[PDB]
Amino acid sequence: LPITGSMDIAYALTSTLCLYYPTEAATEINDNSWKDTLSQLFLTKGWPTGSVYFKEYTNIASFSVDPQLYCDYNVVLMKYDATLQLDMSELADLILNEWLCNPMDITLYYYQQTDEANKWISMGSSCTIKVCPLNTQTLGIGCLTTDATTFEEVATAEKLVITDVVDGVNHKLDVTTATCTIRNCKKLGPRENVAVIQVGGSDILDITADPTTAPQTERMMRINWKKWWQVFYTVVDYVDQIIQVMSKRSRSLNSAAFYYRV
């Protein structure tokens, strides 16, 4: 709907905050009441008491299992390593973006792509995704329609895979439909309710499959560390900027999932 205002007239909380931390921080701090200390620090900062929830994840891969967050304002601390950058980028792109998915099945249907705003998402314990294209008359090229060995590998021993292939061609997929489920999702736009704080070194986190584009938005932040309490203090004492850099939900067709909005 149109908005009508003016440019010459002088024109000028009750939200939720979730902090996501690795369990290694909990192991290192060696305390049980530090949640109370953080709550009281937030209360001093100007947040209401009993209005902050903390969620813990065992591992990066484990947290990649249905990562749907349940806060209006979200900031997640992500571990740093140089041997798992792909999965970190996958998680960042799945969290920072909004997606609308559809159910799929591999043993009965064929699938294809037609727009670059649609990709394949498989989530679960482990997804051994294998795929090869077809021709118009449904004959395998570099593969046989029944042989599961000649199928090219695109994902092995992965807990969360975001795959994209050449559009406009039907494809056949093979995976064990008892350990991982696949869905067809489209990128509707930006998800402004979340932010990622990469606690570590240089950033390789790419939020797009297009090579020519390297979007470095203001919703991605990087910081070095040697003690977890330093990171926690920096996060708590600087809520204003990390909150004003984000906004509320812009979704036109909301999903069905749990939410924590006190």
């Binding site: 004959l139 090229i141 559009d167 406009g168």
Partner: protein
């Protein structure tokens, strides 16, 4: 008596739309009007096809 060669694929419809949109400049006006004057049919459509 050879194994069937894998049939070729088709240019992407998106690329087709891009190419057809880009081809706009290379069209004359009066000649196109006179061609539209001439009736066509199934035999006249695919003469060069």
């Amino acid at each position: 008596n050879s194994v069937t060669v894998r049939q070729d694929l088709e240019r992407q419809l998106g690329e087709l739309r891009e190419e057809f949109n880009a081809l706009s400049q290379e069209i004359a006006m009066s000649q196109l009007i006179d061609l539209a004057l001439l009736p066509l049919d199934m035999f006249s459509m695919f003469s060069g096809i």
